[PDB]
Design a protein around this ligand. Structure first.
Ligand code: NA
Ligand SMILES: [Zn+2]
Length: 305
């Protein structure tokens, strides 16, 4: 069984009408789960609020206190040129991190074989002391650190296939031998890091603009899988971003739904080998509403196989 974590509060976050990281991203996912009838092989779960101790396993106290103080009573408060808080962003971000924590508790406990968190705002750009690029708290990193420190797991792997490099995840874990990060990312591209001075636990593969899926499959098969087979992670955490899609206006790569299906199958195989199938996956980016819905459904269906 596959758990599906979301919350209505996540729709209340918005950063202006023009902004592509918008509430209709979550509604597009809901519509496609209906039109595909794949919403019937998952169990719906409500995301809880993340508590401070969950956040402080990843972020600094000043980071958390800043966003709490920055949360506006009305209008918007700017974070960076394309990231702002509205009076709902704080609650939404707690739900997004909350989802990832609670999915982790449910998978380790054996309630679900795996889970997906259909949540907003995304996480993987949020460094321990830097909110940026639509991200406030690093949902995936917070979930992995939950499994390490609370459930006392010894080894976890983070898979990030968003088009943008997960700088936030690299900045959290470059001294943490219990974590392996495997990723693909468009290069050179925002956030313009991740290609150099890679810690030994960082397996982040730069990908050229306009690359199609066969380049990513080759990269995953020849580079990720031997790292993962050597590491044997006891659980897998997924920064499931779908903006490397051919139809995405914010990326310049050319994946399609079948690629996301194929990638998820690999994640399943690694998890079945070493992790008792335990996977938690969190929505990152992905901005064409039709292709986002279609790509999340292909991902989710491969999790429920
Ligand atoms: Na990435
Ligand atoms: Zn992205």
């Amino acid at each position: 069984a596959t758990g599906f974590y979301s919350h209505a509060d996540c729709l209340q976050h918005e950063m202006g009408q023009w902004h592509p990281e918008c509430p209709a991203r979550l509604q597009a996912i809901e519509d496609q789960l209906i039109a595909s009838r794949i919403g019937e092989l998952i169990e719906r779960e409500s995301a809880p609020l993340a508590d401070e101790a969950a956040l402080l396993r990843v972020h600094t106290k000043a980071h958390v206190d800043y966003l709490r103080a920055r949360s506006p009573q009305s209008g918007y408060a700017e974070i960076d040129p394309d990231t702002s808080m509205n009076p709902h962003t704080w609650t939404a971000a707690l739900r997004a991190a909350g989802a990832a924590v609670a999915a982790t508790d449910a998978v380790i406990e054996g309630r679900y074989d795996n889970a997906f968190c259909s949540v907003r705002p995304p996480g993987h750009h949020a460094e321990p002391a830097r909110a940026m690029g639509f991200c406030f708290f690093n949902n995936v990193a917070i979930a992995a650190r939950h499994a390490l420190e609370v459930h006392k797991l010894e080894r976890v792997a983070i898979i990030d296939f968003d088009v943008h490099h997960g700088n936030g995840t690299e900045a959290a874990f470059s001294n943490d031998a219990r974590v392996l990060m495997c990723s693909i990312f468009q290069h050179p591209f925002y956030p313009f890091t991740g290609a150099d001075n890679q810690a030994p636990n960082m397996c982040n593969v730069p990908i050229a603009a306009r690359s199609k899926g066969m380049v990513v499959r080759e990269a995953i098969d020849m580079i990720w899988l031997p790292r993962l087979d050597a590491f044997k992670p006891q659980m897998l955490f997924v920064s499931a971003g779908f903006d490397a899609h051919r139809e995405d206006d914010l990326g310049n790569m050319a994946l399609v739904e079948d690629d996301y299906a194929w990638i998820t199958q690999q994640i399943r195989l690694v998890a079945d080998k070493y992790a008792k199938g335990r996977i938690v996956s969190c929505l990152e980016g992905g901005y064409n509403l039709s292709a986002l819905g279609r790509s999340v459904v292909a991902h989710v269906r491969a999790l429920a196989d």
